[PDB]
Amino acid sequence: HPETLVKVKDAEDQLGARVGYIELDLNSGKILESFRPEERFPMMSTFKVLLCGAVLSRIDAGQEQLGRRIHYSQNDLVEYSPVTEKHLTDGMTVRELCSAAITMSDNTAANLLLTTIGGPKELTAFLHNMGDHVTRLDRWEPELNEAIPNDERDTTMPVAMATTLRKLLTGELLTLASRQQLIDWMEADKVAGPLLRSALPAGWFIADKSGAGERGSRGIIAALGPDGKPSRIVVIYTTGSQATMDERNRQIAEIGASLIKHW
Ligand SMILES: *C(=O)[C@H]([C@@H](C)O)[C@H]1CC(SCCNC=N)=C(C(=O)O)N1
């Protein structure tokens, strides 16, 4: 609905920076509304859902196991690793690393998982192979969050990310058990409270993943819908703003309230 575009465009103006938005029908793939849909924005932590999608694809192909254990050390820890910092002694399983990477904000977990698939080049190849010729991962954590103006490294486009998420969650890309595992991790997200979740009505389902990087970069990807089932995908990205985190959170929350009101 155009009234939500009023909010999206007001956010761009209030934040003094680009805002990318897309609302997609989960079942049909129809783009219901968009703003700068084909412009590039830094993925930040939102790439982690695609990373676990690549890990699950390997699990489905017999190349990886959810219970496989990975041992790491102090040397491997990078900034923002609150889950991985606590398991230096006995390590963590692949399933536990994806949980940490998606549900919490843990950079080392993502780096450990990236290593398992062969690095950023392989995540990018996985995406290219499933039809997403836009989304690309180039670096590891935490450098991938640099958000250099005009840099295409580690970016996606709102439309590319939304249609890729649709394919991962409901397409034949992943088995039914793997599809559900990915969406269960997203549903369990614990660090996106002040964003779309703050506008979600009672009884509604939400599975998401937020991210924040350098230079004001902030975003969220989500599958949400009424009566406990997701029916639409929402992708919101922004980069370049000097505004406070709270201000950026509020704008995303208000876009969410508008899309919910006009559902
Ligand atoms: C993704 O989960 C990132 C990071 C761990 O790669 C986290 C960091 C933050 S907030 C901390 C940094 N502030 C902004 N630069 C978020 C978040 O979505 O709040 N994602």
Swiss-Prot record:
Biotechnology: This protein is used as a marker in many commonly used cloning vectors, such as pBR322 and the pUC series.
Keywords from the UniProt entry: Antibiotic resistance, Disulfide bond, Hydrolase, Plasmid, Signal, Transposable element
GO molecular function: beta-lactamase activity
InterPro entries tied to this protein: Beta-lactam/transpept-like, Beta-lactam_cat, Beta-lactam_class-A, Beta-lactam_class-A_AS
EC number of the protein: 3.5.2.6
Further comment: The beta-lactamase present on pBR322 was cloned from plasmid R1 (R7268). The class A beta-lactamase family has a specific amino-acid numbering system, sometimes called Ambler or ABL numbering and often misspelt as Amber. A multiple sequence alignment was used to derive a consensus sequence and then the consensus was numbered taking into account insertions and deletions. This allows use of identical numbers, e.g. for active site residues, despite differences in protein length. UniProt always uses natural numbering of residues, hence there appear to be differences in numbering between this entry and some papers.
PANTHER family given in the database record: BETA-LACTAMASE (PTHR35333), BETA-LACTAMASE-TYPE TRANSPEPTIDASE FOLD CONTAINING PROTEIN (PTHR35333:SF3)
Function according to Swiss-Prot or TrEMBL: TEM-type are the most prevalent beta-lactamases in enterobacteria; they hydrolyze the beta-lactam bond in susceptible beta-lactam antibiotics, thus conferring resistance to penicillins and cephalosporins. TEM-3 and TEM-4 are capable of hydrolyzing cefotaxime and ceftazidime. TEM-5 is capable of hydrolyzing ceftazidime. TEM-6 is capable of hydrolyzing ceftazidime and aztreonam. TEM-8/CAZ-2, TEM-16/CAZ-7 and TEM-24/CAZ-6 are markedly active against ceftazidime. IRT-4 shows resistance to beta-lactamase inhibitors.
Protein name (record): Beta-lactamase TEM
Originating organism: Escherichia coli
Gene this protein is translated from: bla
